[PDB]
Ligand binder design. Structure first.
Ligand SMILES: Cc1ccc(CCC[C@H](CC(=O)N(C)O)CP(=O)(O)O)cc1
Ligand SMILES: Cc1ccc(CCC[C@H](CC(=O)N(C)O)CP(=O)(O)O)cc1
Ligand SMILES: [Mn+2]
Ligand SMILES: [Mn+2]
Lengths: 410, 410
């Protein structure tokens, strides 16, 4: 039995995780949902508790703690350990009855819970790409200390890449470890992109495109922030850096390719030039499930891929003139140091300004470029706690710098 | 240091094997070519011996044995073991210095050599699909006795399938064994076909196609027999049965799909419904090389796949009305017993009759159908020697029956 905790159980990753766990458990009892953790959605956590009956419930916000306790009394034959805040999260991470932790929380609490999952030598199914981009050095250092911890990628392209690898090789290394690509005989990565809603726009059309245009065309339904990143292709820019850190692939060996059908989820070229790819309908249940079953697979009742019906798969190179965020991401990654931290932080601000109709499409990349140009490389801290503080300081500086650039031009 | 013998070294598979070995050896000294074996092409063998300097040379035709001995005296610093006939082939197979044997021989001598390779517990890189189709039972039995012997598939689609698997699971089993698909979590196979030259033709157009029409294959120059099989799609029919035997995949779980670009070489759907596929330009060096490097990969200098340039990949269902050979292959496979032997043997005759303008396109399938309808299931011998004799008897019976049907019509 696979003992799982879900952090951010009411968000998109968390709900998809529970959906595929539910369906797989109908076929064979494979998963024990041991713990659920949410910020403040007490009623939604209660409904999940009633169905899954986890040993642990944790809610971050103290103001709904007593309500959760009273709601849980209604459930028959059920006496969970009901916990609160960062201390509850740490208790869940340290439990000997939990093997795998799904991190479906964004922002700092995602990184913080990832840190504690790694410190307790757990398998960590990580969906939060911003944490890998911003704090990749820190995660690498931490995984080198806590040698039985493993990050398994959930981001769909990185799951695809991971699924293209021979586990006879993967098991002799792990993600975020130096020489991962060499041990797995990886030569090059094709990183697939939907292209986003603006993929066919002219430069003149891009100049005054708005957030409404990005949001009101959802071919895949997803959150506002990632939708804007998909529109600018900064999502793929971040994913390039995510690929570099997860798999130790050189930036010159990562190619972004626009695959509008979203069937092939990414491809790995090996040193012999044979290419392996992973394919399915766009459905986050497969990447999430693989993160929890790896190195095995289990039966699902998902719709089988009908390739004949799909009929055509297409690929083209993205235009860097139309999607300058892609170039900025490569430049930041190649520069190294804390430039990825700065890229991510400045994008956080610029994305949100565009989302709220404060700046235009090309202002996004302008702001990010200016913050990157402003940044000065720092000596990388040797101590993990100092390094974390350094990352947070630079993240905060870069957000403030982006906001300051906006305030001056406004 | 990979120790390899090449059987049929001057044929298409043999020459491609030596080509990729040559190129890979320039990058790193990986392969020692330990033995070369040919029928009667003494000059071509001498030229290969000059380059590769194998410990063993064998020529099947005793009439050119002394000629080979005299030619080989011209090579400096080289004192090989020079053998002849079946006795030389068997001595090579029994050598402790040889680990892997590439079988690039068609017809009976290919099967006989495969048998001896298996009896000596070697890794056998096998492209001869007709032998797997015709004698799969016998090969399975032989592989159960000789526990360290392994067949590694070289047929491009089956190499593709094999490359899509997790070697952590493959290493717990081996090809042409019961439960291979269960151990590897395989649910279903997409078996890719070029579709040959006739995909867009009407039934009335197919009625009148000639072997000259059939020989103009859209993607690939290859031998006349396989070119005719590609035109009728009996090539894919035979490969369906090959898939069933190599990977223990049920016939209901093998889907033939027409992929005219011949970039994706086949796909494996796992029990979670995730699909893995292998891709490269049409080039037999990749399947041959993997058969010799498995479970590892080595560096090549092959042209990298340019997916953006390829641009489009297409997939559609084959029409069984237009390509009735496909249906006959499934029927023979599903029926089991020696029906695959009969299918292969009758096709051998019908293919050749069509190639030499003696029958029409739909006569190929008509003849095969009539022979299959005339066969009666026979009790399968539990004795290995009697089983091989049954297979030979039924093969011969089926060829004669096909010829008799033609004769009585003609
Ligand atoms: C599994 C799956 C594959 C593809 C899609 C379509 C959206 C792709 C991505 C969102 C993402 O980063 N995922 C899903 O990891 C948008 P884009 O950057 O344009 O490729 C959804 C779900
Ligand atoms: C490696 C490689 C892949 C594909 C091709 C194109 C010809 C495909 C095949 C020939 C074959 O059975 N091979 C190569 O195993 C013809 P078809 O039956 O129509 O699919 C050539 C070479
Ligand atoms: Mn993604
Ligand atoms: Mn083939």
């Amino acid at each position: 039995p696979i003992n799982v905790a879900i952090f951010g159980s009411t968000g998109s990753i968390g709900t998809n995780a529970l959906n595929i766990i539910r369906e797989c458990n109908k076929i064979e009892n494979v998963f024990n949902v041991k713990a659920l953790y949410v910020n403040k959605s007490v009623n939604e956590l209660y409904e999940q508790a009633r169905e899954f009956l986890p040993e642990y419930l944790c809610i971050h916000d103290k103001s709904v703690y007593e309500e959760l306790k009273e709601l849980v009394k209604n459930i028959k034959d059920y006496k969970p350990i009901i916990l609160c805040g960062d201390e509850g999260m740490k208790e869940i991470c340290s439990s000997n009855s939990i093997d795998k932790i799904v991190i479906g929380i964004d922002s700092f609490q995602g990184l913080y819970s990832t840190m504690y999952a790694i410190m307790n030598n757990k398998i960590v199914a990580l969906a939060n790409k911003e944490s890998i981009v911003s704090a990749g050095f820190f995660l690498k250092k931490l995984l080198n200390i806590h040698k039985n911890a493993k990050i398994i990628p959930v981001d769909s392209e990185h799951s695809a890449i991971f699924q293209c690898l021979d586990n006879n090789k993967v098991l002799k290394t792990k993600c975020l470890q130096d020489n991962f690509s060499k041990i797995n005989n990886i030569n090059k990565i094709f990183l697939c992109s939907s292209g986003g809603p603006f993929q066919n726009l002219t430069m003149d059309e891009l100049k005054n495109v708005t957030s409404e245009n990005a949001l009101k065309h959802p071919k895949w339904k997803m959150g506002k922030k990632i939708t804007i990143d998909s529109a600018t292709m900064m999502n793929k820019g971040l994913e390039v850096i995510e690929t570099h850190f997860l798999f130790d692939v050189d930036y010159n060996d990562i190619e972004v390719i626009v695959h509008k059908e979203c069937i092939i989820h990414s491809c790995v070229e090996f040193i012999d030039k044979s290419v392996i790819s992973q394919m399915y309908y766009p459905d986050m249940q497969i990447p999430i499930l693989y993160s929890l079953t790896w190195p095995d697979r289990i039966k699902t009742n998902l719709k089988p891929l009908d390739l004949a019906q799909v009929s055509t798969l297409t690929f083209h190179k993205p235009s860097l003139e139309h999607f300058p965020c892609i170039k900025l991401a490569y430049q930041a990654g190649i520069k190294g140091n804390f430039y990825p931290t700065v890229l991510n932080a400045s994008n956080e601000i610029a994305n949100n300004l565009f989302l709220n109709n404060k700046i235009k499409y090309f202002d996004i990349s302008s702001i990010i470029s200016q913050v990157l140009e402003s940044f000065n490389s720092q000596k990388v801290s040797e101590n993990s706690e100092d390094l974390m503080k350094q990352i947070l300081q630079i993240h905060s500086w870069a957000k403030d710098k982006a906001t300051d650039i906006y305030n001056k031009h406004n």
